[PDB]
Amino acid sequence: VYEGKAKKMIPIDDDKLIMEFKDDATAFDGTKKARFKGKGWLNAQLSVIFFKLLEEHGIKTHFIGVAGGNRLIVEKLDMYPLEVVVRNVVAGSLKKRLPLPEGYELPEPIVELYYKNDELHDPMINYYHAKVLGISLDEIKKIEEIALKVNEILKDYLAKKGIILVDFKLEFGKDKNGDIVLADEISPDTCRFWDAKTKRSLDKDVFRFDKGDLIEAYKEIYERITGEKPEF
């Protein structure tokens, strides 16, 4: 059993594991910490909806099934040590890299690669760093191609629900066939979602910058997407 900041990973056999979503939330390299009753449930359910949508569009994900509420069954993968960030609208750390205001609409998507490494606080890397880390150029290109395809599908789907997909973080791993498979989660923890009309955050930024009620914000996302009220 691996216990992370947001989730628990419980081995089943050699082929699969249980991904359990906790109520814990962290920010700022994990220096800001809180708990939000029902957060795990919402993130689990939204991950499921997103993975299923993406699977219908021919994206290979680790999603296998549900294991009752806060737990997903997922394929075990040899993980790439990357966080792959896709950005449509300027926000967060991008403001420190390009002299563009928050809300600036990008002419095309930006993909950023981050090296998952706590010693180094997850630095941004490029393709040459990735190669030194054992990730070939073809693997990187395949990964960015998938991320960009995921972007189009999620942003289209969300725009039709009055939600702007500002940016989001993905993780990937390799399966036993050597195929690149989308992993981890897709939730208001790992994406920026803005209301189309008011431009307000319906995501982890509410917690990051004390913008109000996180659970309310995560509920509103769930309701706008499912059309139903959360049961917890």
Residue 113 binding: pick among ligand ADP, a copy of itself, none (C-beta 5-8 Å cut-off by kind): a copy of itself
Which residue is associated with the tokens 């189009």?
152
Reduced to 3 states (helix: H, G, I; strand: E, B; else coil), residue 158 is: helix
- Comparing CB distances to ligand ADP, the nearer of 21 and 193 is 21
Alpha-carbon span 68 to 155, nearest angstrom? 28
Instruction: Using CB under 8 A, list all residues that contact a copy of itself.
Output: 96-100, 106-113, 115, 117, 119-120, 123-126, 128-129, 131-133
Q: How far apart are CA 90 and CA 87, in angstroms?
A: 7
Cα–Cα nearest to 141, from 166, 111, 186: 111
Phi and psi at residue 23, in whole multiples of 5°? -80, -5
Cβ-in-10-Å burial (0-12, 13-18, 19+) of 107 comes to exposed
Phi, psi of 43, deg, nearest 5: -65, -40
Nearest-approach distance from CB 4 to ligand ADP, in angstroms: 2
Smallest separation (angstroms) from ligand ADP to the CB of 26:
7
Closest CB to ligand ADP among residues 9, 110: 9
Question: Considering beta carbons, is residue 96 or 229 the nearer one to a copy of itself?
Answer: 96
Residue 67's binding partner out of a copy of itself, ligand ADP, none, with CB under 5 to 8 Å set by partner kind: none
Per CB under 6 A, residues contacting ligand ADP are 4-7, 9, 62, 74-77, 79, 171, 173, 183-184
